[PDB]
Amino acid sequence: GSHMSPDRCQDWLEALHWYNTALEMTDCDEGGEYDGMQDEPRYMMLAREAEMLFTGGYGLEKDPQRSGDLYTQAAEAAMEAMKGRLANQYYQKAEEAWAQMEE
Structure with a gap:
């Protein structure tokens, strides 16, 4: 390969389709894909906050x-x-956040 690319363009729809009810663990397969990401990621700031x-x-x-x-x-x-x-993951964490209110 030349450079890891986000060829998993359908995976985010798939991921959100199956949902993640906090207690559902996933692969957490988040390495480093460098292609098309010519943007200063806001999601990291939003998730950091x-x-x-x-x-x-x-x-x-x-x-x-x-x-x-x-x-x-x-x-x-x-x-x-x-x-x-x-x-x-962030959605998993959103669910966990609210799940803490019903635990």
Whole structure:
């Protein structure tokens, strides 16, 4: 191969189609695919803040609600960036965030 490319363009639809109800673990197969990603990834920022809202971050109080809202937005931006694995994980984390309120 020349360079790992996001040829898994259908995988993010597939991933979100099967859903991820928090407690569903996946392969977590997120390595490094460099093709078409000519953009400054917003989903990492959104997920980083979501993480700060999840476990408590730099001046961010833990809030499962905002945490999931940020993770769901992050998943949108992730699946937008042809990265289904990230979208799935962030969605998995969004579900976990709210699941913590019913546990």
